[PDB]
Amino acid sequence: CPLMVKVLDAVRGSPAINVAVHVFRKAADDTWEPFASGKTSESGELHGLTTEEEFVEGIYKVEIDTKSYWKALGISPFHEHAEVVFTANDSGPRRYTIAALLSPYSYSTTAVVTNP
Template structure:
């Protein structure tokens, strides 16, 4: 039984990952996208607060960008190629507020991903959320359209 649940969770994640934005439409490039799925309901996680921080020379985290996920559980347009320079970045998802708004008592305050940017690569950060656990993964590629 547990293995079939794990299989379904993995399958949901694959479907979630496969819904990439179209390439070649002439739109501005989107070097950082966030996608969030609520695995309890099996739907996109809407209005999840997202904050991006950049590590400063003094080792403190400085605010870099923020927003909320759309009705599709996605957040585009956080930054541009010009602004996403070499450095260490942290993406923080406000999971506590999301779950509290649905009447759950969550275990985590937030979910975070810390990564180093070392070139002009583009990132899609994906998160699968439940009240007591989360899983993240990243697709790293060349430029994608927003």
């Protein structure tokens, strides 16, 4: 599993469950092609998005539908979504965890890159 997404709720102190996540790769045409998506589990995590064969170097975008999450809780949010855009670079066996911590008017995101 070369790419995992984890989403946390800073208002409830809980995993953010049932959040839609979409992953795009930048094409040679310089446009966003979708290629993976899912919803976060009870633990706030989304696994199995891609494989080591498919997850080649390139520019990637991870979109997290935070607005629908806050609306589901009856909280009016600021952002339409959280967007994380990054370059995947090969330099050894690497796994990427994209974490996002959500509040109605703020989010944080960090990348944890590790060699198994």
